[PDB]
């Protein structure tokens, strides 16, 4: 909804009232295996909810789909009302923001990603380039030894006032089919594309859950993703209103 006392908050909330269509495009190269992914779906920031289907448009995906979840749109996070002044991601819209990561897979290779997230008309677009190097051919990634699932996790967000953006580092644990875990250490920075002001947040976290599934009628290599992302970690207003 639109009704906030801060007109800067109102501007960003306005763009994300209702269901917004999403397009995702990724071009990737991991150890010289070139691939492309296209995704479509919709986001509903009121509930923190994304529903997306991704297709590998070059044939078989050379890495496991779960390793691409975090790469393949944090403006759809649900920020509670008392935290809306800390929503960097919507405040950068519609001009958008850049999201850069390095992801280190423990005892394996790394991904470097750069994405631009912005509106094209009514559609929110996430355009990504991914470069992966130093992977082991018989490791868990190029060897496809990961389970097709995704563990819930919390991620801390901090301002980077020098870059007028945010930074975040966090660990993802991917499940290996033998019951072990493959760690993926993420380093992330985001910066605005426009030159206007943005909301720089106090420290807080995002709580994320994802469900991965398959489309039984789809013969192409693909992933169906339901993702929820909710902001938390700042207590109400002046204090607690219920004591």
Curated annotation (Swiss-Prot):
The outcome of changing residue 150 to A is:
In Cerulean; leads to improved quantum yield, a higher extinction coefficient and is 2.5-fold brighter than ECFP
Reported effect, residue 150 to C: In mut1.9; shifts fluorescence lifetime from 3.03 to 2.74 ns
Classification via Gene3D superfamilies: Green fluorescent protein (2.40.155.10)
Q: How is it used?
A: Green fluorescent protein has been engineered to produce a vast number of variously colored mutants, fusion proteins, and biosensors. Further generation of mutants led to more stable proteins (at 37 degrees Celsius for example) with brighter fluorescence and longer fluorescence lifetimes.
| Effect of substituting residue 160 to V | In EBFP2.0; shifts the excitation and emission spectra to shorter wavelengths and increases quantum yields compared to BFP
Q: Which UniProt keywords apply?
A: Chromophore, Luminescence, Photoprotein
Please report the PTM annotation for this entry.
Contains a chromophore consisting of modified amino acid residues. Maturation of the chromophore requires nothing other than molecular oxygen.
Outcome following mutation: residue 73 to N? In R10-3; matures to the red-emitting state with excitation and emission maxima at 555 and 585 nm, respectively
Q: Which SUPFAM superfamilies match?
A: GFP-like (SSF54511)
Q: Please, one GO biological process term?
A: bioluminescence
Q: Which domain of life is it from?
A: Eukaryota
Changing residue 198 to A: what effect? In mut1.5; shifts fluorescence lifetime from 3.03 to 2.72 ns
Give one Pfam family: GFP
Instruction: List the InterPro entries hit by this protein, alphabetically.
Output: GFP (IPR009017), GFP-related (IPR011584), Green_fluorescent_prot (IPR000786)
| Effect seen on changing residue 54 to L | In mut3.3; shifts fluorescence lifetime from 3.03 to 1.88 ns. In R10-3; matures to the red-emitting state with excitation and emission maxima at 555 and 585 nm, respectively
**Coiled-coil regions listed in the entry:** none
Tissues and organs where the protein is expressed, per its UniProt entry:
Photocytes.
Question: What is its quaternary makeup?
Answer: Monomer.
The UniProt entry's sequence similarity note says: Belongs to the GFP family.
Protein name per its UniProtKB record: Green fluorescent protein
Q: Which organism is it from?
A: Aequorea victoria
Q: Which gene encodes it?
A: GFP
């Amino acid at each position: 909804h639109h009704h906030h006392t801060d007109p800067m908050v109102s501007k960003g909330e306005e763009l994300f009232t209702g269901v917004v269509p999403i397009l995702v495009e990724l071009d990737g190269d991991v150890n010289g295996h070139k691939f492309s992914v296209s995704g479509e779906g919709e986001g509903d920031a009121t509930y923190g909810k994304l529903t997306l289907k991704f297709i590998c448009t070059t044939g078989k995906l050379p890495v496991p789909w779960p390793t691409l979840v975090t790469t393949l749109v944090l403006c759809f996070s649900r920020y509670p009302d008392h935290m809306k002044q800390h929503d960097f991601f919507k405040s950068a819209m519609p001009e958008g923001y850049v999201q850069e990561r390095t992801i280190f897979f423990k005892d394996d290779g790394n991904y470097k990603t750069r994405a631009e997230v912005k509106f094209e008309g009514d559609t929110l677009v996430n355009r990504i380039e991914l470069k992966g190097i130093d992977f082991k051919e018989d490791g868990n990634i190029l060897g496809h030894k990961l389970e097709y699932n995704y563990n819930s996790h919390n991620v801390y967000i901090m301002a980077d006032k020098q870059k007028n953006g945010i930074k975040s580092n966090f660990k993802i644990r991917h499940n290996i089919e033998d019951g072990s875990v493959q760690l993926a250490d993420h380093y992330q920075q985001n910066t605005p594309i426009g030159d206007g002001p943005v909301l720089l947040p106090d420290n807080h976290y995002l709580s994320t859950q994802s469900k991965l599934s398959k489309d039984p009628n789809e013969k192409r290599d693909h992933m169906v993703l339901l993702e929820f992302v909710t902001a938390a970690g700042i207590t109400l207003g002046m204090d607690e209103l219920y004591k």
